[PDB]
């Protein structure tokens, strides 16, 4: 009995010479796990990864 | 009995010399897992990856 | 019986020479796990990773 | 019986020569685990990692 | 019976020559675990890691 | 008999060798063998001898 | 008989070797063998002898 | 008989060797073998002898 | 018989060796073997002898 | 018989060796073997002898 769940995330990453340049923005290069059961509300935002709001 | 669930994410990545340049935006090059059961609401946003809102 | 849960996140990362330059923004290159059962509210924001709000 | 829980986060990272330069922003390159059961409120923000609000 | 709990965080990190330069901002490169059951309030902020508010 | 009068002679010489090598993730797995990845200069006037071997790079011999 | 009168001779010489090597993650796994990744200069006037070996780099011999 | 009158001779010489090596995470695993990653200069006038070996770098011999 | 009259001779010489090595996380694991990572200069006029070995770097011999 | 009249001779010499090594986390694990990471200069006029060995760096012999 499982609801709103991330069970298993397995990542093997062997990068080499990685570089990231970001001006006034949002950059993600990793591992992100978000588990949420219930979110409610007007104009509401849930589970935003790399999100730019102007 | 499983609802709103990400069970297994397996990634093997052997990058080499990766570079990312982003100005005022959103860039994702990783692993993102989002599990949500119930989201409700007007103008609501759920599970946005690489999302630019102006 | 599991709800609103991240069970197992396993990451092996062997980077070498990684550099990150960010001006006035948000950058994430790691491992982020967020588990939330219930979030409620107008204009509310829950589980934002790499989020720029102007 | 588990709700609002992060069970197991396992990370092996063997970086070498990593450098991070950030001016007036937010940068995260580590391991962040946030578990919350219930958060409620207008204009409320919960679980923000790498979040810039202007 | 577990609610609002981070059980086990295990990290092995073998960095070498890491340097971080930050001007007027927020930078985190470590291990952060936050567990909260109930947070309530308008304009309230809970579990912010790398958060810049202007 | 060798007579040099007012002469200039270069005999058995490597004069100028210039090499630039840029790599990233160079990896070598070798079992019971010979792998050469370097820079090698060998200069010899006289090598004399039956069955002799001079200037071998990356050389495997299992003579039986 | 060797007679040099007012001569200039370079015999068995390596003059100038210049190398630049830039790597990142160089790794070598070697079992019962020979791996050479360096810079090697060998200069010899005279090597004399039956079955002799001069200037071997990365050399495996299992003569039986 | 060797006669040098007013001569300049370079015999068996390595003159100038210049090397720049920039690495990051160089790792070597070697079992029962020979691995050379360095800089080596060998200069010899005369090597004489049956079955002799002169100037070996990264050399494995299991002669039987 | 060797006669040098007013001569300049360089015999068996390594003149100038310049090396710059920049590393970070250099690690070496070696079992029953020979690993050389350094800088080596060997200069010899005369080496004489049957079965002789001169100027070996990273040398493994298990002669039987 | 050797006669030098008014001569200048360099025989068996290493003149100038300059090395700069910058490391961070250098670690070496060695079992029953030979690992050389240093700077070595060997200069010899004459080495004479059957089965002789001169100028060995990182040398393992288990002759049987």
Our CA-based measurement puts residue D28 at a distance from the nearest CA of chain A, in whole angstroms, of 10
Render the burial of A41-52: b for 16+ CB within 10 Å, e for the rest: beebbbbbbbbb
Single out the residue of I46, I37, I42 nearest to residue I19, CA to CA: I37
Which technique was used to obtain these atomic coordinates?
cryo-EM
How far is residue J59's CA from residue J53's CA, in Å, rounded to a whole number? 10
Which residues in D lie closer than 8 A to residue H24 (C-beta atoms)? 16-17
Nearest to B36 among A33, A46, A52 (CB): A46
Which residues in C lie closer than 8 A to residue E3 (C-beta atoms)? 37
**Residue G1 in contact with residue H4, Cβ under 8 Å?**
no
Size of interface F-H (CB pairs under 8 A): 5
Three-state secondary-structure class, residue H33: coil
Chain-centroid distance of CA D25 in Å reads: 15
| Deposited resolution, Å | 3.6
Size of interface A-B (CB pairs under 8 A): 213
- Work out how many domains chain H is built from and give that number: 1
How far is residue G41's CA from residue H57's CA, in Å, rounded to a whole number? 10
From residue H38, alpha-carbon distances to C37, D31, E15, I60, J26 in Å are 59, 40, 27, 17, 15
Contact: chain B with chain E (3+ CB pairs below 8 Å): no
Three-state secondary-structure class, residue I38: coil
Domain around C19: 1-54
Neighbouring C-alpha atoms within 13 Å toward the C-beta of F10: 8
Single out the residue of G9, G1, G18 nearest to residue G45, CA to CA: G9
Which residues in A lie closer than 8 A to residue D29 (C-beta atoms)? 30
| DSSP code per residue over chain J | -EEEES-EEEEEEEEEEEEEEE-SSEEEEEESSEEE-SEEEEEEEEEE-TT-EEEEEEEEE---
């Amino acid at each position: 009995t499982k609801e709103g769940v991330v069970q298993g995330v397995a990542t093997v990453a062997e990068k080499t010479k990685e570089q990231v340049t970001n001006v006034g923005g949002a950059v993600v290069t990793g591992v992100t796990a978000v588990a949420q059961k219930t979110v409610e509300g007007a104009g509401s935002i849930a589970a935003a990864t790399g999100f730019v709001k102007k």
